Enzyme design. Sequence first.
Site, mmCIF file in Angstrom:
data_model
loop_
_atom_site.group_PDB
_atom_site.id
_atom_site.type_symbol
_atom_site.label_atom_id
_atom_site.label_comp_id
_atom_site.label_asym_id
_atom_site.label_seq_id
_atom_site.Cartn_x
_atom_site.Cartn_y
_atom_site.Cartn_z
ATOM 1 N N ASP A 113 -8.457 5.207 -54.867
ATOM 2 C CA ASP A 113 -9.765 5.518 -55.420
ATOM 3 C C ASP A 113 -10.881 5.088 -54.471
ATOM 4 O O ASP A 113 -10.739 4.107 -53.743
ATOM 5 C CB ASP A 113 -9.957 4.777 -56.735
ATOM 6 C CG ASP A 113 -11.291 5.063 -57.330
ATOM 7 O OD1 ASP A 113 -11.597 6.263 -57.417
ATOM 8 O OD2 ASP A 113 -12.029 4.123 -57.671
ATOM 9 N N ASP B 287 -14.845 4.723 -55.273
ATOM 10 C CA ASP B 287 -15.895 3.820 -55.771
ATOM 11 C C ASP B 287 -15.321 2.556 -56.391
ATOM 12 O O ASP B 287 -14.485 2.615 -57.300
ATOM 13 C CB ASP B 287 -16.766 4.513 -56.811
ATOM 14 C CG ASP B 287 -17.566 5.642 -56.239
ATOM 15 O OD1 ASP B 287 -18.319 5.403 -55.288
ATOM 16 O OD2 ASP B 287 -17.429 6.780 -56.744
#
Length: 295
Positions: free
Chosen positions: A86, A88
């Site tokens: 991922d 953020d």
Amino acid sequence: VSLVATLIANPAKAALAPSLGIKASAAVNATGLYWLADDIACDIPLPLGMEASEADASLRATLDGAPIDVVVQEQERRRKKILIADMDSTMIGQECIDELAEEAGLRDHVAAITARAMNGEIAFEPALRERVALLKGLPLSVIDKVISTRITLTPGGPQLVRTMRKHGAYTALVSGGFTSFTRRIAEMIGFNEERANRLIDDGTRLTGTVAEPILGREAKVEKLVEIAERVGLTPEDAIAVGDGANDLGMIQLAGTGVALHAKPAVAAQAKMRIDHGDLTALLYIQGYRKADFVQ
Ligand SMILES: [Mg+2]
């Protein structure tokens, strides 16, 4: 088949002293103790017949207080050939949508929504639409500005990706955030590819909308499936890492799924959690020694 425990500290707070690793291994009547990185990570092969759940609670009890993570897994297939990570609050320190909102003067308002979406209290897609609509009118110049001045790479990230690539792994950056960010971030860290949502613009300013359809939890699962099929493997050959509720699909599907610095509701739904280590934790999980790392 045989289990191994791995204890992992953050290299910035490297509290896994030799005496502490020895005490831990004695606490699980271990066959041995193998240092992956001095003061940072060690492997503890478990004697045959101990439930993984036993070692975990036993090791956590011995370590109680110390900022040291515990993971337990089968030894045989721990080194993975796919990374899906991922963006953020995982590979970067920030939420790109909150940093964009600051430029609209709306950081706190948007950040409160982001926090609820991260925790799973609101569905990802309506939360993204709501937040992006508040960015309507922002000049496209803002993106480069935010990247250059407020985005920072999470410690360990480049070493993770590059060491994994050195050993032939395929690496992908996925995000419910935006391609304007993932393209630059993937290049800075060294990923093979990235996939994210797309901000719509009129050629000069943001429209306040996202390209349809919106990519959320299931899109990260689907991308893991797509990568594994394309490289002739399965999701069990992948390690997946994220911080948020929308990462739990890929975290749960992957052979090794890691909740990194997640808050409790999210970490509770992942089989492995790294609350203290940085992204080098994922190398130690896979059994790499520091001598293997790309420096
Ligand atoms: Mg995230």
